[PDB]
Design goal:
This is part of a larger assembly, with 3 copies of chain A.
Chain A: H1 4-19, H2 27-34, H3 57-70, H4 84-101, H5 108-118, H6 132-140, E1 150-152, H7 153-158, H8 169-179, E2 186-191, H9 197-209, E3 220-225, H10 228-232, H11 244-250, E4 257-262, H12 280-283, E5 291-296, H13 297-305, E6 314-319, H14 324-342, H15 348-361, H16 367-385, H17 393-405, H18 417-421, H19 423-430, H20 435-450, E7 460-464, H21 471-483, E8 490-492, H22 520-528, E9 533-536, H23 544-554, E10 573-578, H24 582-585, H25 597-607, H26 611-614, E11 619-622, H27 628-644, H28 658-668, H29 677-696, E12 707-708, E13 712-713
Parallel strand pairs in A: 2-5, 2-6, 3-4, 4-5, 7-10, 7-11, 8-9, 9-10
Antiparallel strand pairs in A: 1-3, 12-13
The complex binds phosphothiophosphoric acid-adenylate ester (2 copies).
One phosphothiophosphoric acid-adenylate ester binds near residues 193 and 372 of chain A.
GO molecular function, one term (chain A): unfolded protein binding
Family (chain A): Belongs to the ClpA/ClpB family.
Keywords (chain A): Acetylation, ATP-binding, Chaperone, Coiled coil, Cytoplasm, Isopeptide bond, Nucleotide-binding, Nucleus, Phosphoprotein, Repeat, Stress response, Ubl conjugation
């Protein structure tokens, strides 16, 4: 109800009546409280609403002292009988004043006002008007000041607005050590955004709230300064100093250990300096004016480069991210806040896994926030879904994260079935033979899905064999099964090389040079798409400088960029290709991959491909030769897909191909030295060419047949009508 | 002094005295300043105390116009002599309100209130802005609008579109 | 000779003389032409120089309508007859205004000034157009946007060039 100051003045009125041996309390006794002390700082006595308003404080002093002498000496027992209606009314009026003034507590000024409004000198010896406006003016110009300049974190903390923080006790102590300096009063927190800089300032506030602060700072209070009053609050040229200088001086003395702080101190460098608030502050740094700032490391760098002065006042305080275990500790401290915020229970394992998840899948975010996001997001997820529950650790988190960050890998299937149990079948259905390539694909994904693959390495395989054997097709089909979308594959022509390639590859352009589109094909796409299948079109012909660079993705997945940042791959499957082995494939020694032969190939590949790459690669995969037996399946597969891809079914075929057509293809388009690719030449050269002509001649109205000639031919529906 | 929102209204009021070529600014010109243009955020006219107070602000504008046409002269050279003692009182009243509110500047909220204290319609069942107590009930919802800066996508959606 | 706007108005004015079957086209019909219909885009009527000046567009209209009633309605042979000497004067005066204003084609606005000068709705319930100061200021404030930022290629095409 009352401020401590208001209570003091009222209390003094009461106790002065006791000390002066006076019966019922009168307006006189509150006036006695007003003149209770010689201290000029006491507004009720010298730096008064009277003295700086309209009348000599002595006039009033003598009104009161005359009256105090005039009231007769009583037995101590009644010395302060009651406030009666007289002081009751003054206090009630002080409350009416609060309502008029919109003041949350009764001020000593409300007591000064209310008393003065009711009061009049009781005797002819002194006269003075109750100059209400003068006393209000003087009251308004005193004490109330920071609500116009900075947000009072400490009182708001007393009011429960503070978020307590843990695990930063040294960082908090560091700000204390700096704040405890006698000369260099200015600390600043420097680090990554999301590192916990504001959190540390609030940590200081927590230290203040629990009064765990050294005498120099023991009475401290924190206030959030800048942008509003320092920028929005400006229309005139001197507005960088009006209000700003004002508050700097308002807080230098008496009013406890006021410490302002800046959360976004980046501004305080000035756009071209020009003392845009920025210089006046350090200009006054020889004393008081204790302020703590906060900036990111790069913003720090920028304000340093753009100023050269605040840095002589401000102590650089480095803030490091916590370890995963430490992150969990803060998560635990924060856990109940989240359970409350969302009305859901959270498992300790939720917190544990959130933190390690973040380390694994959120490289662009710091652990404090990243882990918290996984928690607060999961909780929010449930809060929305709550119309139905609680948060369940990795269950909720893996799904939640995958939904936002990508990586469905962690969701686990409703049924593993086609999801890597029967996948070898499904892959063998799309492509024929080459089961080891198929197994490699499945295994790559299975290890990823199971959390077993070495996390530092993307699945990586190099595919050897004769072009036309399905090496690209495999990669595309992998994307097919990986995303249920074959166009999500990333494919780079790795053979387009000379040394002049930086940006075309993950290296990017370099900032400071023309062009700021970097590694678009790889770096930008990788940043955007957390995983894919990356196909390198004949690494056999790629320049070795690039291959050496690609190695970095191949293993130890970290990826740099000319932007000064990194990408850091993880879950992208990479596929490299070569036909070196064609020199051995053309031996035609069985459809199966032969021992020794395949080794001569891989040996030669190393000779013509840095083994350093191959010494990191998950494995080299070799394709089976497409024997006619393989063809006997492939032809149907391809004719089916080829037809299905032909726009819409306004015609298409009945396809009475039977063995006769199949064999023709196996006897005519079947080049032992070019895989199935020449069968496609046959198919288009014969089947589609005739078809196109029949369509062109409008000899087909709907459907179509394939009729073996002894070659192939088509039928006529309308007779060239 | 006055801030920009109050100054806009005050400027308009004086402008209106000149728009009507009148020698002095009268309460009617200020009421006319309150209702200038159909810009919703204008508490003096549309997102106002009047609608909240269950009054028709356009009807009130008709009242204002009925009063404006009764201005005794529109003579050019005689125009723009004084802000008038009548409004001296009103602006002084606004200053009194600032003291009552501990306010460092006069906002349109204050200038509205001050005129309202001295305003009238010579009508029993006044179609005037709702009386002062309601003026306070709604004026006190202010301080202690976005449509000026943004499109209400939700409302457009409510309206289909 | 005339702008597309002036032509619209004069087409309408002459049209009105035949719609109401009047003995001659009068200043009243041109005022009525300006009051084509209460279209939101109606520059000479809803957004006009009178409404933003001194008098209510709705009441102005009613006077004009009373005048259209007062001008006798006759049979098709005596109906319409002429543009009238009255408007031969108004439109020639509008042409004089064009020269004063450096504008090659007659603006409907110039017609409003020439027209208004002849007319005078001297009712005790005056609707007489607000005089020239309000009329002109509002006329000068008409639009004043896109043309400061653009070339009207379509008018240019109408004007050749
Ligand atoms: N040590 C900690 N104690 C308590 N809360 C923390 C801690 N570390 C992080 N947080 C949480 O992190 C969020 C605010 O993070 P901060 O690190 O202050 O953000 P910030 O990094 O200060 O913002 P920048 O980078 O200066 S814009 C809050 O939601 C806190 O719950
Ligand atoms: N093993 C297979 N199973 C099913 N269909 C196949 C198979 N092999 C090829 N098809 C055909 O294989 C051809 C694609 O050839 P690929 O071997 O992927 O090209 P490759 O790869 O050479 P690139 O592109 O430089 S690696 C297509 O035209 C398919 O019709």
């Amino acid at each position: 109800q009352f401020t401590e100051r208001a209570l003091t003045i009222l209390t003094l009125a009461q106790k002065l009546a006791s000390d002066h041996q006076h019966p019922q309390l009168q307006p006189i006794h509150i006036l006695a409280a007003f003149i209770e002390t010689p201290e000029d700082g006491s507004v009720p006595y010298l730096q008064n609403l009277i003295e700086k308003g309209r009348y000599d404080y002595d006039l009033f002093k003598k009104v009161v002292n005359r009256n105090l002498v005039r009231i007769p000496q009583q037995q101590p027992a009644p010395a302060e009988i009651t406030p009666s209606y007289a002081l009751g009314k003054v206090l009630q009026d002080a409350a009416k004043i609060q309502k008029q003034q919109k003041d949350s507590f009764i001020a000593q000024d409300h007591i000064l006002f209310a008393l003065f409004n009711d009061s009049s000198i009781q005797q002819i010896f002194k006269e003075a008007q109750v100059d209400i406006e003068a006393i209000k003016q003087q009251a308004l110009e005193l004490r109330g000041y920071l609500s116009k300049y900075a947000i009072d974190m400490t009182e708001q903390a007393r009011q429960g607005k503070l978020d307590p923080v843990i695990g930063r006790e040294e960082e908090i102590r560091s700000t204390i050590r700096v704040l405890a300096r006698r000369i260099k009063s200015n600390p600043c927190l420097i680090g990554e955004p999301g590192i916990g800089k504001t959190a540390i300032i609030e940590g200081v506030a927590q230290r203040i709230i629990d009064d765990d602060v050294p005498t120099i700072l023991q009475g401290a209070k924190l206030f959030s300064l800048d942008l509003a009053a320092l920028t929005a609050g400006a229309k005139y040229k001197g507005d960088f100093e009006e209000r700003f200088k004002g508050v700097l001086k308002e807080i230098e003395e008496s009013k406890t250990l006021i410490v302002l702080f800046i959360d976004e101190i980046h501004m305080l460098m000035g756009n071209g300096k020009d003392d845009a608030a920025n210089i006046l502050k350090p200009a006054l740094s020889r004393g008081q004016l204790k302020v703590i700032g906060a900036t990111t490391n790069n913003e720090y760098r920028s304000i340093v480069e753009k100023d050269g002065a605040f840095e002589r006042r401000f102590q650089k305080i480095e803030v490091a991210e916590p370890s995963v275990r430490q992150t969990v500790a803060i998560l635990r401290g924060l856990q109940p806040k989240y359970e409350i915020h969302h009305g859901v229970r959270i498992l300790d394992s939720a917190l544990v896994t959130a933190a390690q998840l973040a380390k694994r899948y959120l490289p662009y975010r710091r652990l404090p926030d990243s882990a918290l996001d996984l928690v607060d997001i999961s909780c929010a997820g449930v809060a929305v879904a709550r119309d139905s529950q609680n948060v369940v650790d990795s269950d909720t988190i893996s799904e939640t994260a995958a939904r936002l960050t990508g990586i469905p890998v962690k969701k686990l299937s409703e049924s593993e079935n086609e999801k890597l149990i029967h996948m070898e079948r499904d892959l063998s259905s799309e492509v024929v033979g080459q089961m080891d390539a198929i197994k490699a694909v499945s295994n790559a994904v299975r290890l990823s899905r199971s959390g077993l693959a070495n996390p530092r390495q993307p699945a990586s395989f190099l595919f050897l064999g004769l072009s036309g054997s399905g090496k690209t097709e495999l990669a595309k089909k992998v994307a097919g099964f990986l995303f249920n979308d074959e166009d999500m594959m990333i494919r780079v022509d790795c053979s387009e090389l000379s040394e002049k390639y930086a940006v075309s590859k993950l290296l990017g352009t370099t900032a400071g040079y023309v062009g700021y589109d970097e590694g678009g094909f790889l770096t930008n796409q990788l940043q955007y798409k957390p995983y894919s299948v990356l196909l390198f079109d004949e690494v056999e012909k790629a320049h070795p400088d690039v291959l050496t660079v690609m190695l970095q993705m191949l293993d130890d997945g970290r990826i740099t960029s000319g932007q000064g940042k990194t990408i850091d791959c993880s879950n992208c499957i990479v596929i490299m290709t070569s036909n070196l082995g064609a020199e051995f494939i053309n031996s035609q020694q069985g459809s199966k991959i032969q021992e020794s032969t395949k080794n001569l190939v891989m040996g030669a590949v190393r000779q013509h491909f840095r083994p350093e790459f191959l010494n990191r690669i998950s494995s080299i995969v070799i394709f089976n030769k497409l024997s006619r037996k393989a063809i006997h399946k492939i032809v149907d597969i391809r004719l089916k897909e080829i037809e299905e891809r032909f726009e819409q079914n306004d015609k298409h075929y009945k396809l009475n191909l039977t063995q006769e057509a199949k064999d023709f293809l196996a006897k005519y388009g079947y080049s032992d030295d070019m895989g199935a690719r020449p069968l496609n030449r046959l198919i288009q050269n014969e089947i589609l060419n005739k078809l196109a002509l029949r369509i062109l001649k409008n000899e087909i109205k709907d459907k179509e047949t394939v009729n073996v000639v002894l070659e192939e031919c088509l039928e006529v529906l309308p007779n060239h009508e």
